[PDB]
Swiss-Prot record, chain B:
Alphabetically ordered keywords of this record: Mitochondrion, Ribonucleoprotein, Ribosomal protein, Transit peptide
Protein's UniProt keywords contain Flavoprotein: no
Gene Ontology annotations for the cellular component aspect, listed alphabetically: mitochondrial inner membrane; mitochondrial large ribosomal subunit; mitochondrion
Location, primary (coarse class): mitochondrion
Protein name, as recorded: Large ribosomal subunit protein bL21m
GO biological process: mitochondrial translation
Top-rank taxon, per record: Eukaryota
Other noteworthy facts: Present with 1850 molecules/cell in log phase SD medium.
Full-sequence range covered: 44 to 161 of 161
Subunit structure and binding partners: Component of the mitochondrial large ribosomal subunit (mt-LSU). Mature yeast 74S mitochondrial ribosomes consist of a small (37S) and a large (54S) subunit. The 37S small subunit contains a 15S ribosomal RNA (15S mt-rRNA) and 34 different proteins. The 54S large subunit contains a 21S rRNA (21S mt-rRNA) and 46 different proteins.
Curated annotation (Swiss-Prot), chain C:
Function: Component of the mitochondrial ribosome (mitoribosome), a dedicated translation machinery responsible for the synthesis of mitochondrial genome-encoded proteins, including at least some of the essential transmembrane subunits of the mitochondrial respiratory chain. The mitoribosomes are attached to the mitochondrial inner membrane and translation products are cotranslationally integrated into the membrane.
Family: Belongs to the mitochondrion-specific ribosomal protein mL58 family.
A GO cellular-component term linked to this record: mitochondrion
Domain of life: Eukaryota
Listed InterPro entries: Ribosomal_mL58
Keyword vocabulary terms for this entry: Mitochondrion, Ribonucleoprotein, Ribosomal protein, Transit peptide
Annotated protein name in UniProt: Large ribosomal subunit protein mL58
Curated annotation (Swiss-Prot), chain E:
Subcellular location as annotated: Mitochondrion
Disulphides: none
Additional observations: Present with 1800 molecules/cell in log phase SD medium.
Highest rank taxon of the organism: Eukaryota
Stated role: Component of the mitochondrial ribosome (mitoribosome), a dedicated translation machinery responsible for the synthesis of mitochondrial genome-encoded proteins, including at least some of the essential transmembrane subunits of the mitochondrial respiratory chain. The mitoribosomes are attached to the mitochondrial inner membrane and translation products are cotranslationally integrated into the membrane.
Descriptive protein name: Large ribosomal subunit protein uL22m
Subunit text: Component of the mitochondrial large ribosomal subunit (mt-LSU). Mature yeast 74S mitochondrial ribosomes consist of a small (37S) and a large (54S) subunit. The 37S small subunit contains a 15S ribosomal RNA (15S mt-rRNA) and 34 different proteins. The 54S large subunit contains a 21S rRNA (21S mt-rRNA) and 46 different proteins. uL22m forms the wall of the exit tunnel.
Family: Belongs to the universal ribosomal protein uL22 family.
Taxonomic lineage of the native organism: Eukaryota, Fungi, Dikarya, Ascomycota, Saccharomycotina
Curated annotation (Swiss-Prot), chain F:
Top-level taxonomic group: Eukaryota
Purpose: Component of the mitochondrial ribosome (mitoribosome), a dedicated translation machinery responsible for the synthesis of mitochondrial genome-encoded proteins, including at least some of the essential transmembrane subunits of the mitochondrial respiratory chain. The mitoribosomes are attached to the mitochondrial inner membrane and translation products are cotranslationally integrated into the membrane.
Assembly, per entry: Component of the mitochondrial large ribosomal subunit (mt-LSU). Mature yeast 74S mitochondrial ribosomes consist of a small (37S) and a large (54S) subunit. The 37S small subunit contains a 15S ribosomal RNA (15S mt-rRNA) and 34 different proteins. The 54S large subunit contains a 21S rRNA (21S mt-rRNA) and 46 different proteins. mL44 forms a heterodimer with mL57 and stabilizes rRNA expansion segments 1/2 at a membrane-facing protuberance close to the point of attachment of the ribosome to the translocon in the membrane.
The protein's name: Large ribosomal subunit protein mL44
Similarity remark: Belongs to the ribonuclease III family. Mitochondrion-specific ribosomal protein mL44 subfamily.
Biological source species: Saccharomyces cerevisiae (strain ATCC 204508 / S288c) (Baker's yeast)
Miscellaneous comment: Present with 300 molecules/cell in log phase SD medium.
Compartment annotation: Mitochondrion
Domain DRBM positions: 42-112
Length: 34, 118, 176, 148, 77, 130, 138
RNA sequence: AGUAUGAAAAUGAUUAUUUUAUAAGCAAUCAUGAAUAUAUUAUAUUAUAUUAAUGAUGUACCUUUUGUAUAAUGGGUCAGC
RNA sequence: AUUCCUUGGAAUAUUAUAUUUUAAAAUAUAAAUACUGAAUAUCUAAAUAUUAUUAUUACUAAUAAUAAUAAUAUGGUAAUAGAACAUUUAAUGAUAAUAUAUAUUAGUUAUUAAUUAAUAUAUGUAUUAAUUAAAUAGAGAA
């Protein structure tokens, strides 16, 4: 019951990384607010 | 030079050069040469004695005038007509006189009748 | 086989940055002789002899022995796409005549209770096969048709047009 | 003759992927490379009267390489119409605000031809500071590449 | 339905302060209309529209968009 | 037609093939792309039938390359394999479409086969029927 | 199932036989009218006969009409060139005639840079594909 | 300021075809898709015509000046003289 | 590509390809002429003028008309020189409503012009073709 899917080697082998804190993020803005 | 896979194919193209101008054709095409031929008249046939490249989908013979022995590529002359008339207007920037430069260059039309391996 | 040198369609200029420029190609010239230039292209609409598979050539044609409908891809790796369950696990002819008759009878009787899917589930067999076997009560069919019509009517303008376009596309995609 | 045939695949927009973690080109160079892809100059069917460029997904943009002291010292500018409202922001500041992706995008924009198509081409480029993204599925991938 | 200018508009001088002179003109027009029928003409145009729609080629995703430009007498592929 | 007939009449004995040659020069010289003549109902089934008829493993469509899934215009490349021999490449904006195209291609290949003059006149087993 | 969608064959003038494009030429002149003097001379001078001898697949009509002198020529495709040879002399008229004969009937038209070949044959090699390229992009 | 006639232009309204609501500059030229119209040889994978997708190129014209896109002269447009 | 000797050759190296052998090793081939870049030059045709050679056509034939071959020349304000066309009038002047004149559209001829076809309006019909003579003879510039 599988579907015909492929995947690029460039995207498979890409090590996981977290995106850092953007100041124009809502979350960050919340912190800033008074 | 083993020329069997060109022999065996059904579709075949050639890159013949008239006066060094390369034209890439198959059989049944109409080549519009941008000049008037004096050697050939209408209805005459030209055997191309300069063919840079013959090619199938996957193989291609090449060479500076490759032997006339190997192929037969012959075009028939259909038309000698001119390309449309134009008057490009020549003038400077504070001078009232204009020089009308007329242009109606001439064309020779061929039809690639035969294109085969020999 | 042939032991020809193989080449890309070369440009004297940088391919990455200037592939569309004809002049470069013209400028390039290669040493006289034969060459192998694999077509940088799919063979979908084509009818070229160097495109036809060996299995579809007659057992006599010299092109069979030659090597230019290349098997570049390998079937082991490629995932099955939009395939029926009978292909993955071979077809079965287990179902007898009596059973078939029974199925037909059921279909005739109550289509909404004994729908194709249900039948398939019951007899370990394809819905398509069931359909082939047995016609449902014509009343049911009529009802279905009516429903379909109603649905169509319920469409907006844009949707109808879209549908039409889709249909056209479908039609086109069997031309090749 | 050559132009005749089924040309649908040629003008198909491929999605390309560049992992900036695994690419050692410095910012500007990378941007330049991307620009070509966006324009569609890489393909032999390109004609300047046509947007035929591919999609580029950049991921791990946080690990982009910038040389010298440019991170601190390189200043991006923005002016409203109003005199005295010149904003000058250092690259680092910009990164903190929006991200490395923005930086990359700016470069790409600068690279690109300045005409109608520009904006579309720019928008084709999708950038992400970290690894994760929503386009993972649609990057071009062959069946023979599936050994990994 | 439309407006034409009718014939002979009479220009009058309109004296303003200091020695200044305007020229007032009194315009006269005519309205002409053409009334057709919803039964025939409108129906016909609707039909035409429908035909046009039918003709319209579909938007294909990988449509065979012609390779615009001259070839050059040389294969790029 | 009459002209042709006349020609035949005059050259029935001295050069029998002359008429035919003339026809070839005039009537058979005209371009017709045979690829543009076809239109298939559901080609996959037909292809399968053909395979069955011949000595071929059942045809299976398989994904060769894929790009731009989750987009307005994707590209899927599917080949129709018979064991190992690829029987028809097919591109498409959808998977289904691609599959269909592959089948059509295969059918075209089967039909429009053009053998050489050096071959011994090939005679087909008619058309596939399903 | 296979269904046939109709089509027709396209004529390629020169591939099998070659039909000569020009079919009729009508030398039109006037007895009275100085503009038609050269034409008259041409008609007189056995040149016409010579031309006929040369090119028997094309027929020469010779009309008498009150206006300026003409060389209306009729071609296979259907189109008709017409050259008014007002006030020309014999040689110029002959040249005009030659020009008429040489041309195929087709209409004049601006060509772009390097638009040489005109085929109705599908490319021998395929149209390039990004997925079937020898070199992948990056 | 004769009488007939008047598809001469400028100018107004309207209808059709087409292009146009993310786009910036003598409004054209060249390239180049697409849409529409006509065509009694479109046999078509046709030809012309119309049309501001899109791309490139492109400082109105005259006068007078060492020199003008000039923010120097002159012209509201057309018809007649 | 790098090195040596005197545009060249050689060696070395690199890249690419092919073949053999066990992703390597051996053999052969090719590439090394960087490329873009003008309305420059050449080639490829066309026009005009001159110089020098021709060929065809027709009774200053040592000419004219047309066509070749080789060469040289063909930006241009003020200005000089040469050649044409449109318009109108006078001299000579067939012809004809299937004709003509004017207009619109699409063709044609190296095209400010004329001609062809279709269409619309006149008009029992050209100061018509052509050669002369002349001009209130050509307008985005006051
Ligand atoms: Mg000046
Ligand atoms: Mg000027
Ligand atoms: Mg470049
Ligand atoms: Mg009135
Ligand atoms: Mg007052
Ligand atoms: Mg007023
Ligand atoms: Mg200036
Ligand atoms: Mg003023
Ligand atoms: Mg020059
Ligand atoms: Mg001069
Ligand atoms: Mg005057
Ligand atoms: Mg005026
Ligand atoms: Mg003027």
């Amino acid at each position: 019951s599988t579907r015909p899917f492929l995947v690029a080697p460039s995207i498979a082998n890409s090590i996981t990384t977290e995106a850092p804190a953007i100041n124009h993020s809502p979350e960050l803005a919340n912190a800033r607010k008074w | 030079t083993d020329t069997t896979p060109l022999k065996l194919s059904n579709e075949l193209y050639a890159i013949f050069k008239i006066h060094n101008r390369p034209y890439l054709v198959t059989e049944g095409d109409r080549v519009i040469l941008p000049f008037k031929l004096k050697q050939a008249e209408v209805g005459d046939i030209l055997n191309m004695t300069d063919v840079t490249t013959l090619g199938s989908r996957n193989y291609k013979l090449v060479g500076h005038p490759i032997n006339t022995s190997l192929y037969t590529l012959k075009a028939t002359v259909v038309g000698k007509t001119k390309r449309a008339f134009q008057t490009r207007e020549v003038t400077k920037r504070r001078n009232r006189r204009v020089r009308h430069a007329k242009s109606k260059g001439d064309l020779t039309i061929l039809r690639i009748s035969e294109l085969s391996m020999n | 086989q042939f032991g020809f040198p193989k080449t890309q369609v070369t440009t004297i200029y940088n391919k990455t940055k200037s592939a569309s420029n004809y002049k470069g190609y013209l400028k390039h010239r290669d040493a006289p002789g034969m060459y192998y230039q694999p077509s940088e292209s799919i063979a979908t609409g084509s009818v070229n002899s160097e495109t036809i598979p060996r299995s579809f050539m007659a057992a006599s044609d010299p092109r069979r022995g030659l090597d230019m409908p290349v098997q570049s891809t390998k079937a082991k790796q490629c995932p099955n796409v939009l395939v029926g369950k009978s292909t993955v696990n071979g077809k079965t002819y287990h179902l007898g005549p009596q059973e078939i008759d029974e199925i037909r009878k059921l279909r005739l009787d109550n289509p909404q209770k004994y729908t194709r899917k249900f039948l398939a589930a019951k007899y370990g067999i394809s819905p398509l096969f069931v359909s082939m076997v047995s016609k449902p009560s014509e009343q049911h069919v009529q009802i279905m048709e009516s429903r379909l019509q109603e649905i169509q009517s319920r469409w907006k303008e844009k949707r109808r047009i879209a549908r039409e376009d889709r249909k056209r596309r479908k039609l086109l995609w069997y031309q090749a | 003759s050559q132009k005749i045939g089924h040309s649908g695949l040629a003008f198909a927009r491929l999605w390309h992927h560049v992992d900036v973690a695994r690419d050692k080109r410095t910012l500007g160079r990378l941007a330049s490379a991307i620009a070509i892809t966006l324009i569609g100059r890489h393909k032999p069917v390109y004609h300047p009267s046509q947007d035929c460029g591919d999609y580029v997904v950049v991921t791990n943009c946080q690990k982009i390489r910038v040389t010298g002291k440019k991170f601190e010292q390189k200043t991006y500018w923005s002016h409203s119409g109003r005199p005295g409202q010149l904003k000058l922001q250092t690259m680092n500041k910009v990164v903190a605000d929006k991200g490395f992706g923005e930086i990359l995008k700016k470069a790409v924009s600068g690279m690109l031809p300045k005409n109608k198509l520009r904006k579309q081409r720019l928008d084709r480029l999708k950038v992400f500071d970290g690894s994760e993204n929503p386009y993972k599925q649609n990057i071009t991938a062959f069946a023979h590449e599936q050994s990994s | 339905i439309w407006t034409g200018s009718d014939g002979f508009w009479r220009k009058r001088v309109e004296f303003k302060a200091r020695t200044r002179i305007g020229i007032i003109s009194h315009p006269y027009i005519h309205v002409r209309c053409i009334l057709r029928t919803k039964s025939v003409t409108k129906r016909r145009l609707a039909y035409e529209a429908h035909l046009k729609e039918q003709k319209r080629a579909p938007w294909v995703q990988l449509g065979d968009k012609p390779i615009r430009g001259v070839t050059g007498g040389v294969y790029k592929w | 037609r009459s002209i042709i007939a006349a020609i035949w009449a005059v050259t029935e004995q001295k050069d029998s093939q002359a008429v035919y040659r003339f026809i070839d020069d005039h009537i058979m010289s005209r371009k017709l792309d045979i690829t543009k003549m076809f239109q298939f109902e559901q080609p996959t089934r037909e292809l399968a039938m053909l395979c069955r008829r011949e000595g071929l493993e059942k045809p299976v469509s398989k994904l060769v390359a894929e790009s731009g899934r989750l987009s307005k215009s994707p590209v899927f490349i599917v080949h129709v394999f018979s064991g190992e021999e690829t029987l028809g490449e097919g591109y498409g904006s959808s998977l289904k479409e691609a599959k269909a195209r592959a089948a059509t291609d295969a059918l075209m290949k089967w039909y429009c086969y053009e053998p050489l003059a050096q071959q011994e006149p090939v005679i087909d087993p008619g058309t596939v029927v399903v | 199932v296979v269904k046939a969608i109709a089509r027709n064959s396209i004529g390629r003038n020169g591939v099998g036989a070659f039909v000569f494009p020009c079919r009729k030429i009508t030398l039109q002149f006037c007895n009275w009218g100085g503009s038609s003097e050269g034409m008259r001379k041409f008609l007189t001078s056995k040149r016409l006969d010579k031309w006929g001898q040369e090119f028997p697949w094309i027929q020469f009509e010779v009309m008498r009409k009150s206006g300026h002198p003409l060389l209306r020529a009729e071609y296979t495709n259907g189109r008709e060139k017409v050259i008014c040879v007002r006030n020309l002399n014999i040689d110029n008229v002959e040249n005009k005639l030659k020009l008429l004969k040489d041309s195929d009937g087709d209409i004049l038209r601006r060509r772009t840079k390097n638009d040489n070949v005109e085929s109705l044959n599908s490319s021998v090699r395929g149209i390039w594909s990004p997925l079937h390229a020898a070199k992948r992009h990056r």
